[PDB]
Structure formats: structure tokens, C-alpha cells
Amino acid sequence: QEAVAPEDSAVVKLATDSFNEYIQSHDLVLAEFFAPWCGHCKNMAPEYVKAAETLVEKNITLAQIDCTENQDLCMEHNIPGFPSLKIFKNSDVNNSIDYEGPRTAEAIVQFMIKQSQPAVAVVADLPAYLANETFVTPVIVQSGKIDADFNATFYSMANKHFNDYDFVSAENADDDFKLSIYLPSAMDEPVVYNGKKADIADADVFEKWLQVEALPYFGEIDGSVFAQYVESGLPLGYLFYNDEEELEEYKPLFTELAKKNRGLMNFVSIDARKFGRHAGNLNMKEQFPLFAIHDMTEDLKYGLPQLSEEAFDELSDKIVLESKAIESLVKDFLKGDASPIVKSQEIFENQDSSVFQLVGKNHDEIVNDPKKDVLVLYYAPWCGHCKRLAPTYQELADTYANATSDVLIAKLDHTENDVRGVVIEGYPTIVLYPGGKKSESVVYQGSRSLDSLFDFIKENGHFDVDGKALYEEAQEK
Amino acid sequence: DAYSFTSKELKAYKQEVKELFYFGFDNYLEHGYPYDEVKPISCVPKKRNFEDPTDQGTNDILGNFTITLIDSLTTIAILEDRPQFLKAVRLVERTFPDGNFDIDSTIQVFEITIRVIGSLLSSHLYATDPTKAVYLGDDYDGSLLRLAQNMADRLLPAYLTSTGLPMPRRNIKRTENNVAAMASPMFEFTILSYLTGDPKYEKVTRYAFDKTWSLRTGLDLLPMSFHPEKLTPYTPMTGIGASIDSLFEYALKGAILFDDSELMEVWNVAYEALKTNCKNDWFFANVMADTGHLFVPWIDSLSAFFSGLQVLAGDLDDAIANHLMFLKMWNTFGGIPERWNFSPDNILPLEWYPLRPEFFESTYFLYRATKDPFYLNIGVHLLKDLKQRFKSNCGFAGFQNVITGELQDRMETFVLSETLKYLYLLFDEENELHNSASDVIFSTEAHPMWLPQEVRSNYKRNAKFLPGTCSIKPHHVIGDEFWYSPMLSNFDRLFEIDSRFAATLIKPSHMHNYNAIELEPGFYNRWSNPQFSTCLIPPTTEIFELLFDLPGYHQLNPLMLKTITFETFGGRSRLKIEKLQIYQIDYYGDLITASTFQDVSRKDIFSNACDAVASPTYLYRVVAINGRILPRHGSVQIKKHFKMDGIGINDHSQLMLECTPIINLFIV
Ligand SMILES: CC(=O)N[C@@H]1[C@@H](O)[C@H](O)[C@@H](CO)O[C@H]1O
Ligand SMILES: CC(=O)N[C@@H]1[C@@H](O)[C@H](O)[C@@H](CO)O[C@H]1O
Ligand SMILES: CC(=O)N[C@@H]1[C@@H](O)[C@H](O)[C@@H](CO)O[C@H]1O
Ligand SMILES: [Ca+2]
Secondary structure (H helix, E strand, O other): OOOOOOOOOOOOOOHHHHHHHHHHOOEEEEEEOHHHHHHHHHHHHHHHHHHHHHOHHHHHHOEEEEEOOOOOHHOOOOOOOOOOOEOOEEEEEEEEEEEOOOOOOHHHHHHHHHHHHOOOOOOHHHHHHHHHOOOOOEEEEEEEOOOOHHHHHHHHHHHOOOOOOEEEOOOOOOHHHHHHEEOOHOOOOEEOOOOOOHHHHOHHHHHHHHHHHHHOOOOOOOHHHHHHHHHHOOOOOEEEEHHHHHHHHHHHHHHHHHHHHOOOOOOEEEEEOOHHHHHHOOOOOOOOOOEEEEEOOOOEEEOOOOHHHHHHHOOOOOOOOOOOHHHHHHHHHHHOOOOOOOOOOOOOOOOOOOOOOEEHHHHHHHOOOOEEEEEEEEOOOOHHHHHHHHHHHHHHHHHHOOOOOOOOEEEEEEEOOOOOOOOOOOOOEEEEEEEOOOOOOOOOOOOOOHHHHHHHHHOOOOOOHHHHHHHHHHHHH | OOOOOOHHHHHHHHHHHHHHHHHHHHHHHHHHOOOOOOEOOOOOEEOOOOOOOOOOOHHHHOOOOOHHHHHHHHHHHOOOOHHHHHHHHHHHHOOOOOOOOOOEEEEEHHHHHHHHHHHHHHHHHHHHOOOOOOOOOHOOHHHHHHHHHHHHHHHHHHOOOOOOOOOOEEEOOOEEHHHHHOOOOOOHHHHHHHOOOHHHHHHHHHHHHHHHOOOEEEEOOOOOHHHOOOOOOOOOEOOOOOOOOOHHHHHHHHHHHHOHHHHHHHHHHEEEEEEEHOOOOOOOEEEEEEEEEOOOEEEEEEHHHHHHHHHHHHHHHHOOOOOOOHHHHHHHHHOOOOEEEEOOOOOOOOOOOOOOHHEEEEEEEEHHHHHHHHHHHHHHHOOOOOOOHHOOOOOOOOOEEEOEEEEOOOOOOOHHHHHHHHHHHHHHHOHHHHHHHHOOEEEOOOOOOOOOOOHHHHHHHHHHHHOOOEOOOOOOOOOOOOOOOOHHHHHHHHHHHHHHHHOOOOOOHHOOOOOOHHHHHOOOHOOOOOOOOOOOOOOOOOEEEEEEEEEEEOOOOOEEEEEEEEEEEEEEEEEEEEEEOOOOOOOOOOOOOHHHHHOOOOOOOOHHHHHHOOOOOOEEEEEEEEEEEOOOOOEEEOOOOOOOOOOEEEOOOOEEEEOOOEOOOOEE
């Protein structure tokens, strides 16, 4: 598109001079500071226009400011970049909130509708309000008699989480205090708070309770709603499904798990068709359906065993995840006995060349061995310098392999393998792991020449194997 | 699942590219064979222009030896289809049963070397490598190697010149030459020497390469064209475009493959010269070799390979910045025009798009380096464009003129050899080339090359006739992101080119419907972070560059602390300074505040005249030095270990230009 809303559209074009007057003459106005050239605003324009059309019915105005024309206006508001969706309320030019949600007509409309309403809505009868309007975000209700300090902290949280949730206050003298959360997915089931009344008055306790219990039991995960699960801090259990039928097949078990494991970890459903590469990002192969548990706190991925690529290609029947297997994996992870999955290629069982191809699974095991001295080269297949080093590395590995069998020479593909506890600020990075029970790893800094590498291994090697003479002894023959 | 880029969808795209290549190849076999190429629109062979010798444009490429089949050999090998590769090898043997190219054709040494010899050598390596899925074994008998050796023997007499530099053209059966043509053949000929064990090819071509490099000027920039007998440069113009690209490409690639330190040093010096003089924010402009001043206002399409070359060299950020410009050019024209003016259709001097693979190559290498689905989307759109606009009755036809949209009636061999190959590899994540080999080096024509360790040792033994590093991640990549493309979301300057060159980026008539590749709604709605997918305010300040011809030697890799340290400042140093005026937008998109001018000393402690002048309106800021764009709040210090007028140093030790301090430039 052209990034500029059509004249016939509800959008209002605001110039430098006319901006202040329009802002002062209208209560709530969402202003977009865009630029016709860069395409973020171009993709913004259609959904923005649709949102403006929808909002005009509710009297909320949407405006467009072209920074290319109204330069001074744009600097005056300290615009960082385009598109910058800023909200002006109470005819206040100085005050300008920043829009944060997704750039979709539905998201913008919901955000503006929420901005129009007060932070906390006071309703005489809760059921009438609940039935009157459908909700797209969780509803937190402080029903019953409200303590002054709890009232203050509740309103403070509502101001803090204005965009995250919608807060409702239905005070009844007779009925006892009852804080609750209404998940849009299950409006019938409220998440009543069972803890003591004193601590919840604390801002931190209420924040934690919301961050934990304000998530759908088995909702559909996506980049937009990812921040909600990240903030909770619990481990996230993904379910990849190929089609809606598969999701309906797996929904009962995963809903039961999410309800049972509430407060420990979060379970979500991710559309494999839409997000298959996320499976790779989870250190799991793209073989769906697929259950993977991610621990964002420690950055440890745990998942069910997956068929090998050759077996997967031969396989012609749809993959099925056993419910017992899923439950066992969840239990093991919660207990902590489950072992993580490290980003790694298939173990190089067949080693034709002397250089021992290391994968993430066997890396730490191989280097940590005290019986041998290991010289791991960390390389990326695309980097030229590692390719340049490969011949010399092969010659050195051949020289050591037939000589004393005490120095192991290996390399690991860092792009395809993640090694934890090793600092790789670039490629190539040659790290010597000296033998012995306790021996700090040594990084190679010199020119990566054959003699230089031999001298490095001899000097910094525990076993002090002189490679260069061994190379010469082989050279004479 | 559109633009989701799962493994299954990538397999589907890979199959589509495979089918496209087979369509083109089978059409060539049915119609063009036994001639060099098949005209796609007219479905007739494109025979060598025997009648008109003067037509060197067509005769040079076409020697009438089924060049399309030979070039497609390597593409078939990469497809990992053993039956098809065996059939093609047998067809090549049948076309040349005697094992020699006894064809009366006056042909260009460089192009033939890169295409026929390169393809034959790579195909022989594939056939004789048991690991490769296209291994021939008993069926193969070294025929491809013998044919390559015969062609090399026929081409070598070109190097029997007074200076050892090859003649531009030669007749295999029996004046001006660009540096790329003079030097590049050495890569293929050295591979041939290793395989056969004959040193003569490597010696002669390597000597020619060394002479060509020695012809560079004091700035370490090489004029594109030269006269081998007189050794006089015809054009002071130089750059990374056509006629010089393969020289740098093969300098780096030969350094990598042959483990040659001299070649690596040559590459380092040449690349530093390019960054210092030619490099700009979004492309390597073409500058005069002697002075380093801009020569022409256009950048040719052949230079799109440099993003992949830089990915090989380890500079991800420069490669990304350079590749974005050609992405924008494709968005504007639907096809990268031969030449395009960045400073003002009439903008394009040469506007035909022969379907060159350089953009495809850069996209493939950048995807391999970054694994960013941004480049996967670029490849998907390129495939769609091929099918919808370039596909013809009997092949793929490029634009004869992007301004009008006319399609030329010609399928160049490099189309099948490189464009389809790179597209397939970009979509073939499981290909053996990058999954298993991990040491292959693509030639300039996209022919994989690798010297087996036994061959290397045999060649070294039987002769008879700090270091570099790679950047782990691009700068723009922030933390880890699973949901969104870092290029779309986190590259703030993604669309800066649209505004900066809006004058010269004019969509032709047929381009009106086409949307920007990165802005495809299906791709954008999936691979864009709403939190960070934000434009950047363009700089309203004045930006100018000055040249520092300080004596000494040039430091190839100045050390980075957010500071660049220059132990030596010898040679020309292109410094891109930014004028700072109150209440203006700087290079980094921030609003200049009065605090910037607070505590400013305009007095020269090394002189007296400037003191009276000092006794402000604007300041000076350095944003890029020698082509190295500084980061936000980026300082620069130069070790002392001046005469030039207008230069001064203050108490804070910041160099003054026009008695105006440079806030971030220091002289320690
Ligand atoms: C229903 C309606 O028109 N309401 C408008 C309101 O949108 C506007 O902000 C205000 C001040 O001009 O005047 C009211 O009459
Ligand atoms: C009982 C009740 O709702 N009291 C609220 C109080 O919590 C809030 O801080 C104040 C500001 O709007 O408004 C009062 O009506
Ligand atoms: C000059 C000419 O046309 N030569 C052709 C040659 O291109 C072709 O490969 C061969 C196979 O039949 O037949 C020759 O006559
Ligand atoms: Ca090329």
C-alpha cells in the first residue's frame, strides 16, 4: 500500500498546525506517526484503517501524522521511529501513552476500547456485566467487602496491568471478599484465590498470582502471547499438532495436565503448520505431533525421543504421542531427573577421517576425559577460515593418531551444536583441554600453523606429547 | 502454512526448483542439443554465430561444445540424482568420444575456464568421491578429468605472453583483458594441477594472478582493465562489479582451499582497500583506483556476489547491508538491472536483466550464515517470479529491458548452472554440500570444489616442472528470538534505502502490482516482531567525508574495544564525518540536545591562530572510518606514534576540523 489512509476512510490526517487543536477538541485520539517510505507503516495502514472504521462507531478517533511533512511536530513528541502509535487522552498534548500490542485491527480496536474505559469498572451486578459483553482478556474481580489497603493495591495493579487484563470491582457489603479471575476460554470457571488475605494485599503477591493464574490452561501459543508465558517464569510445554483434529485428539490430556500442574509449568498448543521452525528452535526435529518442555529460566529443553531422519523418511504412518509417555516426561522434568536435549547433530558413529567429529551430545564427555588430551576446533560450515584450517587440522590429527595415541584431535560444528560452558567469540576457536583430573582449558591464540599447533599441544598438554618430532619421524619415512 | 518455512514446505519448494531445472535441462536436450544453448521463447537452438566472427559477445561464450550440458553437470550432481548424472556424463562422453575439444572456436579464456573446466573438474570430483551420493565408481573412468585437462592444455597457450598475463581470447583448435579474466583462472587451474599432479597449470596461472595483483596502485585498488603487453590501465575505474569481482572472489577462495598464506594476505589487503575507499553505507561504490574518488554514480548487478563473499570472509553485517540494497532493487524493478544509478526513467544505463545468479548466491550464503527465514522468503519470491514471469515455452528468459518488461530470447548457461542450483541449495537444507562436506568451496560459476587430502599430499610430495576470524552472529541479532525474523524485526535501517534513494528507485509500469518481498502480508504477519518491527528516523544532519593521506602504513584490522583503535594511520583514510546542529536528527536517529554542545573546547592547544577564532553553532561527529560504521556512542582514538592545514587538537585531545572539535575522534 501507500502507508497513507484513503481520504474516504475514517482516518484523520493531522498536520503540524491542526494537530494540537484536534487533540484538544477530542478526548481520546490514537495518533500514528508514520512515514510513506518504510514498509512497517505500509503493512500497518490496512489494519489501521479497518480499526479506524470500527472505532468511529464507538466515537474513538484515529489520526495519522506524516513525519516526512510534519517534521517539527514529530521531534516535539520525541518519536523514536515509525510507526509509533501514541495515545492522547483527556485532551492532553503533553501526555502520550505508547501502544504496545500487536499491529492488527482487532488488537488496536481492543486496546483503544480499553483506553476509553476507566482502569477499573464498577458494576452493581457481576453476572449482568459478564453476560452483557464478551471478553478477550482475563477479568479480575474484587467481589465483596474490600479493605482499604487491598483496594489501593488492586487499583495500582489495574493501572500497572491496564492493557494486560480488565479489572472489575463489584463491592457488596454482605458477601465476603472474593478475588477471582475469569479466563476467556472458560468463562464458567473462575480461578478463586485461596491464600490468606494479608499477603495478597502486597503488590508482589498479587502480581505473581496474576502472572501465574492469568494464562489459558491449554491456550494457543504464538509470538504475540509469548510474553505472557515468559513473564510467568514457569517452564513452557509446547504441543505441535498438524491439524485441528490432532489438537482435538490431544486436548483432553493436556488440559488435565495443565490444570493439575497449575503453578508449576505451562502447557500450550502451537500450530506446527504455522510454526514448524519453532520445533528446531526447541532442539527437536520437525516430526509432528511433538511435545517439548522448555525451561526458559535455565534454558534447558526436554522432549520425547524422536525418530531418526532416515526412519522418519521410511515411516509412512502418522506419528502418535503416547499419553503415558507425555505424563512420564512431565513427571520426570518436574522431579528433575529428566535429562535435557542439547542442540546437536546425529552422533558421528562412523569416523572415516582422523578428526573426531564432535556433536553437542558427546562434546563435554569427550573433552572432559582425563585419559587423553583433546584439541577441539569450533567452526561454522560457512566461515572460510575454518575451511582453510581443515587440511592442516587433518594432517595434525593424522600425525597424532598413529603417535602415542594419547592426544585426541576433534572439531565441533558450533552453528549446529550448542556447547555450554565454552566461550566462542568467533570462528575458528581452537581450545586445548589438557589431561589430568583438574586442568583448565587453554585457548589457542597463535597463528594456526602445523608447527605452531604442535608446539601449543606440547607446551599446554598434560602428557607433553611432542607432535613435531613425531611429524618429522613420519616425514623421513 | 504459507511462509511458515517448515521442513515439509521447504521440501516442497526444493521439489519445485528441481522440477524447474529439469524442465530447462530437458528442453535444452530436446531442442538446443547438440548446440550450446536453446532459445527459450523461440524453442530453437542458439547456435554459435559461425558466420560473423566479429560478434565476440556471442562467440566468446559459445564455442559449440554443448556448454549448457557441461555446466548443468554440476547442478545435476548437487541434485544427488545418480541416474541423471550418469546419463549426462555418458552424453558428454558421446559428444566428445575422443576425449578432446577439437572445435574451431575463438573463445574467451576466462569464461570457458570458469564454466567448462570448472564443471568438468567438479563433476569428476563428484564422480570419484565415494561419500557423495552421485558417486559413479566403476562406471566412471576419468573421462571428465581427461576432457578438463585437454581443455586446459588448449587454453594454456593464452598465457605464453611477454608478461605472462593471458590473452583475452584464444582459438582452442589452434588486446584489453580485465583483471578478473587475467587472474581468476588460477583457481580452476590449480585445482586441475592438484588432481592431475601436473604443476605447470598452477605455476603459470598463479604467476599470472600474482602479476595482476602486483599491478595494483598505491591505494591497493586494482584498475579493472589492463593491456598485458604494455601493462597500461585503460580505465582508472575499480570496484567489486563486473570484470574485477572474480579476482577478489578467487583470491579469498584459493587462500581457503589451497591453504595459501600469500593468497590470504592478498585478500586481506584488497578487502581493506575496498572497505577504506569503495565501501559505502549500502554498497561498494566504484571509485578511481589512483585517488579513491567516486567515478560513476551506478553499481552493477555483478557486484551482488560480494555479500556471499563477505559471508565467506566472516563479515556478516557488511554482507547483510550490501544484500539489502539488491533486495530493494529487485523490489523496485522485479529484476536486478545490469546497472543502476544511486544519484540521479533513464536512470539505468544498462537495464537488461539476464537472470544472473549473484543475488541468488548472496541470498543462499546469507541464509546459511544467519539461518534467517527472511532470506528463505526472498528465495520463495524469486522462485515465484521465475515460474510466473521468467519461465517460457522451452526455458527461462530474463528481462531484455526492465523498464518496459520485455523478455529477451536467450537462456544463458549460468542460469541453469547457478541460479537454479543456489535456489535449490537454499531450499535444500539436507544437501550433502553443507550438511556433511562442510569444506566445499563454490567456484565463481557455483561448481563445488574440494581437494581430497590424498590428492593434496601427493601433489605436495611430487612436484616436478593475528589470523582471520568470523563473526559468530550479526550485530542486529538481539538475544534469542524463536518467533520472528531478526532481520525484519531488529534491523532498524531495513527500509532506509527506500527513502535515501527514493529518487532513483522508480517502479516501471509492469512493477505497479508487485509488492515488496519483505512486505508480503503472509510473510510479514508471521516473521515480524510487533515490539521491535520499527522504522528508524532518517538523518536530517549534513554528512560529509574527508580524506587523510597521512604517511605510514595502513592497519588492516584496527582493534575494537564501542571504540576503534588505530595504532597506525598511514595511507589514505576515508573518514565520514557528521555535522551536528542543535535540534536535528543525527545519524543514529536521536535528537541532538544542547548537552552535546556543553563543555566544548574550540581552542587549539597545538597552535595560536585557532585560539583567536574560538574566542557553538555546530559540532562534528564521526560515524564511519575507512568504511567501518561506528556504533552508537562510538569513539575513535588514533595513536600518535599536524602539518595538514585546518587540523587541530584541543585539551580533550579531539581532532579539530575548521577549528571545530570532533566529539568522538581522539588523538592519543
Ligand atoms: C457522540 C458525539 O458526537 N460525541 C462528541 C465527542 O466525540 C466529542 O469528543 C465531544 C467534544 O467535541 O463532543 C461530543 O458531542
Ligand atoms: C471503594 C472504591 O472503589 N474506592 C476507590 C479507590 O479504590 C480508588 O483509589 C479511587 C480513585 O478512583 O476511587 C475510589 O472510588
Ligand atoms: C559446427 C557444428 O555444427 N558442429 C557440430 C557440433 O556442434 C555437434 O556437437 C556435433 C554432434 O553431432 O556435430 C557437429 O557437426
Ligand atoms: Ca560469479
